[PDB]
């Protein structure tokens, strides 16, 4: 049982020029990945090559619209990327992010190749920028390209069309993006944990709620499971787990399982509010682990705090190397009302949840 691993380097030359503070740095895969050198997991895995991927590739998810535009910024004057970025809700570009945003998919199209042809069992990516906000027709909230959208249908690309895909997000953020991406779809399940605060929490919709079962012949299998007043954590995230998303998955029985992983609901990110420790990590990645025959796919997609991002990631991946799981407030009564919302809701698409 052989764990992947895939990180470049130069995915750290998307920058902002503007304003180089700004939380998306570049230094947040770099740190990751020291943090793995740094705890002897690095050595513990196989170290699948990065590429990057082609136009055709990303006419998987997104538009050609879409995909023109953003490859004609590897040439854009400063004034062209500032004008350009501010078309987007919260989006910064320079001359290197179109590259950037290439490699982060085909890192993700390789590991899931390594996977789906058996070289390894599970893999993790770290890269960046990252995915999930992104549209077929637009980029939003740091994202170009809907990464892990774009490797559930590689994926199927060199599979069958129809192959079961989950994708569990649990970045403290809604994933407008691959939601609405396979939101007519039923061969990817879309299970999403995020802060939601009755639409107030970025990225600011109702389609986060958790009446948005999926639509047409995908009704059913998009399941949000938004939180609401509370400063949420490790007793929640496994209740959530217990009750909705371990089920629902085995249900589906996916034939692969990919993660889209920020670590921005992490103890001390700036931005999550949240406080989901790296033991709760692992342990999420350990019930992952028991889907799909073990094959899962860890993709980074947020999270801010440097610290926090590295030892929660690098303990996920320990836990992928089959590591025994380490051990983790009393259960916040605002999360139970949120499950049992999504419970009811779900009902209907899911017999194990009767
Ligand atoms: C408006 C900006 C100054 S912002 O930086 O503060 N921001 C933009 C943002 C978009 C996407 C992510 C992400 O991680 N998605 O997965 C994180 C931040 C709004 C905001 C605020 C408070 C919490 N969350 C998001
Ligand atoms: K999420
Ligand atoms: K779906
Ligand atoms: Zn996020």
Redesign the pocket.
Known sequence: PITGLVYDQRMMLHHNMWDSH???LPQRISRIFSRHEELRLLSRCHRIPARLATEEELALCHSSKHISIIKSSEHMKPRDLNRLGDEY??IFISNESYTCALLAAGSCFNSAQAILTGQVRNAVAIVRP?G??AEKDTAC???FFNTAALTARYAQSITRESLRVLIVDW???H?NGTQHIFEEDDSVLYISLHRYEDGA???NSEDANYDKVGLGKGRGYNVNIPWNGGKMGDPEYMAAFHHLVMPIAREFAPELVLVSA?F?AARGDP???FQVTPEGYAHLTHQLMSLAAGRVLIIL????NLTSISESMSMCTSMLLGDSPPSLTPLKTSATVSINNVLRAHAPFWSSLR
């Open positions: 700004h939380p998306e809700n919260s990252p999930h906000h909230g740091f994202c970045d403290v953020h994933g929490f970025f990225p920020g921005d931005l999550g509010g997609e947020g999270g801010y």
